[PDB]
Every structure is written in C-alpha cells, then in structure tokens.
Amino acid sequence: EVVYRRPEARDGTRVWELIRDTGSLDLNSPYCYMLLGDYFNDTCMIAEHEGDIVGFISAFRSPRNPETLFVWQVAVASSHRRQGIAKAMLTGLMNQKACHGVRFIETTVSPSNMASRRLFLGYAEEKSIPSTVTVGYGAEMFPDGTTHEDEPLFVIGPFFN
Amino acid sequence: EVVYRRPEARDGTRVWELIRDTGSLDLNSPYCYMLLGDYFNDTCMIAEHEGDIVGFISAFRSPRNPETLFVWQVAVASSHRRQGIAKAMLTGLMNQKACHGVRFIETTVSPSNMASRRLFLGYAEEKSIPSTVTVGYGAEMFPDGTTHEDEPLFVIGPFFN
Ligand SMILES: NCC[C@H](N)C(=O)O
Ligand SMILES: NCC[C@H](N)C(=O)O
Ligand SMILES: NCC[C@H](N)C(=O)O
Ligand SMILES: NCC[C@H](N)C(=O)O
Ligand code: NA
Ligand code: NA
Ligand code: NA
Ligand code: NA
Ligand code: NA
Ligand code: NA
C-alpha cells in the first residue's frame, strides 16, 4: 500500500515540507526540490501513502563518474518509520533503466544518523559488497554561527567490475 | 585583476555566505554548496578579488539532455556590481573542455531580477541566438507561509545544429 514513483517539479513544495519536518537533514530551498523533480527525477524517488508524501530520496549520477550514484538526502516521515520505506526507495534507484549501472554508491552520513547508517551498511552487507567510511566534510568546514556534525563519506562498492 | 576558477568542496561556506548576502536568491544549505564544488565543479565558477569571493555561478548539464546547461544561481557581490563579472563567469561556463557542447542554456529569472535578465538576453543577442521566455515555476507552486515571485523559464538556443 505505500506506492513509489519519480518526483516531478510540482512535488517540490510537498517534498520541501517533508525535509523541513526531518530535523536530521539540512533544509534546502523549495526551488532546489522543484529542480530535483524537473531535472534529476531519474535518480530521485517519492513514497506516498493515503495522499501524503511519506518518503523521499534525492540522488544524482556524478558528472565526472557516471557509474557513481551520490545519495544526497533520505527522508521518511516520522509516522512511517521502521516499515522498510527507505530501503524500498534505495532499491528503486538501484533497479532501473539507466545507460550505466551503479558501480558505487557515495553518500555522507553524520554519526547521529543511525537509521541512515544502518540503511547503507545493511544494503552493502545484504549484497556482499564492500563499504568504506572516510573523512567527508568535517564540522569545521561549516559556517561560523551555525552548529553541524561531521559528514563522513561512505563509499559502497564496487557493485561489479 | 578579478580571477576566475572552478569551485571546490572547501569553498562551500564562503559561497553560501555570498548567496546569503544576495537577497534576490533563495538560500540553500551550506552542504548544497559543498556538493556543487565537489561534484558539479565543471559547470560552476567562482570569481575572486583581493581574497574575497565576489561572484559565483552554479549550473549543471541536464541528466536527460547533456547538451542543455541549466544555470541555477548567479551571484555577484554588491561591492562588485556593473564590472562584467557575471558575463565573465557565464562565458567561462560556455568556453571549456566538455564532451558535449552547450546547445541550450535553460535558467529561470524572476521579474525583479533585472541584472540577470539583461545577462542572459544580452548574451543571446551578442551571439545572435534565439531566446524564449515561458511559464516556468509559478508563485503558486511555492510553500504556504512563504512569499515568492514567478520563475519564468528562459531557453537560450540552439547555439548550433
Ligand atoms: N546525507 C545528508 C547530507 C546532509 N546532512 C543533508 O541534509 O543534505
Ligand atoms: N534512513 C532509514 C530509516 C527509515 N525509517 C526507514 O527504515 O524506512
Ligand atoms: N535563478 C535563480 C532561481 C532561484 N530563485 C534560486 O535562487 O535558486
Ligand atoms: N546577474 C548580472 C549582474 C552582475 N552585476 C554583473 O553584471 O556582473
Ligand atoms: Na535555490
Ligand atoms: Na519505513
Ligand atoms: Na528502511
Ligand atoms: Na543539503
Ligand atoms: Na560585475
Ligand atoms: Na556582467
């Protein structure tokens, strides 16, 4: 009964509202999410239940390295936690029609983000694929006048050779 | 004496600070700008003068249509207006090493954004290339509880056939 689809530009505001409700994430402009649905919809997903958006994932193929999928934001409505929605979304991005397969997933996961860490490391373990965690963007790179955790880099792959 | 370069992830915060100072633009997270410099640096530019970032442009090749360059944000520090910095940045994105040439520029320009409109329409006129303005994202697509102008779609091209 949760249904999955690609976003469209018109979903921008309802996606933004979901991100704003997901305090673990850094909120971008509404326009950013319109853009994601207009231009990056092949590498993003929405989950919907009873009208409402209950999940979103944003991602893109890296312009330099088209076999690398960068996963930007994973959001699941607080009402719909622990139902497999994030894993269904990620599986959706990985089983699709693209020219190039996904050889690597890259993403950053702050230490507090337990659910996201278990999503990615659990996917890697299920598939028997290596995962590496390295310094990504440290807290010290963030603006003065704002508090932020480290964003360590997770690299999942190679999925194939 | 203004110098132009591709951004890097480490420029994220100083770029964010510039956007935040550019009230015509919608401010994204600092993390967004780190990402732009890490993954999209081939289609972004920074202008620097006496240490300070005085200009930035963000853009990407459309994943579906790699000959289309989408120009996302154009920012010029208030101290450095009317010196050709935006035009130098855009020229930079258009004269480079990519696999595919830029057949179309797409961008949105709200009515209040006079400088940006003259940038794009003036570039098109200089090059003798058509420009079209159509409904892009209307004010009505934006969130309740927030005020926003229309974002009409500008399509500049074809630059070649
Ligand atoms: N993976 C999330 C990275 C960042 N904290 C964001 O919200 O964009
Ligand atoms: N980011 C992963 C967490 C989410 N509750 C889910 O499991 O669907
Ligand atoms: N061209 C700018 C589009 C939008 N107002 C932004 O700031 O992202
Ligand atoms: N967005 C264009 C305006 C900027 N002052 C410039 O001309 O450099
Ligand atoms: Na924006
Ligand atoms: Na869930
Ligand atoms: Na899940
Ligand atoms: Na972000
Ligand atoms: Na200028
Ligand atoms: Na200019």
Please give the structure tokens belonging to residue A8. Answer: 């469209």
Residues of chain B in contact with residue A141, where contact means CB-CB under 8 angstroms, are: 9-10, 12-13, 34
Bridge partners (DSSP) listed for residue B58: B73
Tokens of B76: 């010029």
Q: Which residues contact A47 (CB under 8 A, 6 or more apart)?
A: A2, A3, A4, A53, A54, A55, A56, A76, A80, A85, A88, A89
Q: Mutate which of B83, B89, B105, B126 to test ligand 4's pocket (most atoms within 8 Å of Cβ)?
A: B83
Tell me whether residues B60 and A72 touch, CB distance under 8 A.
Answer: no
Which tokens hold the place of A64?
């330099």
- According to DSSP, residue B16 is labeled H
C-alpha to C-alpha distance for B59 and B118, rounded to whole angstroms: 18
The DSSP bridge partners found for residue B56 are B46, B75
CA–CA gap between residue B79 and residue B74 (Å, rounded)? 15
Half-sphere exposure of B123 toward its Cβ, with a 13 Å CA cutoff?
A: 23
In this structure, how many other beta carbons lie within 10 angstroms of the beta carbon of residue A53?
A: 18
Q: Are A35 and A80 in contact (CB under 8 A)?
A: no
3-state per-residue secondary structure call for B103-125: CEEEEECCCCCHHHHHHHHHHHH
Residues in chain A: 161
Identify whether the C-beta of residue B1 lies closer than 8 Å to the C-beta of residue B58.
Answer: no
Placement of tokens 């370069």 in the chain: B5
Residues of A in contact with B32 (CB under 8 A): 26, 28, 32
User: Which DSSP string corresponds to A13-43?
Assistant: HHHHHHHHT-TTSPP--HHHHHHHHHHSGGG
Chain centroid to CA A125: 18
Interface of chain B toward chain A, CB-CB under 8 angstroms: 9-10, 12-13, 16-17, 26-32, 34-35, 39-40, 42-43, 60-64, 70, 72, 137, 141-143, 146, 148, 151
The C-alpha atoms of residue A27 and residue A148 are separated, in whole angstroms, by: 13
Q: Which helix (H) or strand (E) holds B36?
A: helix B30-39
Please answer whether residues A122 and A141 qualify as being in contact, where contact means their C-beta atoms are separated by less than 8 angstroms: no
| Both structure tokens of A148 | 């932020």
- The DSSP bridge partners found for residue A73 are A58
Residues of A in contact with B12 (CB under 8 A): 137, 141
**Reported structure resolution in angstroms:** 1.5
Tokens of A80: 């719909």
- Technique used by the depositors: X-ray
SS3 B37: helix
Domains of chain A: 1-161 (3.40.630.30)
Is residue A25 a contact partner of residue A71, using CB atoms and an 8 Å limit? no
DSSP H stretches of helix in chain A: 12-20, 30-39, 85-94, 114-127
Amino acid at B82: R
Could you tell me which of A87, A72, A76, A74 has the C-alpha nearest to residue A121? A87
CA distances from B19 to A21, A36, A97 (A): 24, 19, 36
Query: Rounded to a whole number, what is the distance in angstroms from the first to the last CA of chain A?
Result: 36
What tokens appear for A68 in the block? 């690398």
Rg of chain B taking only CA atoms, in angstroms: 15
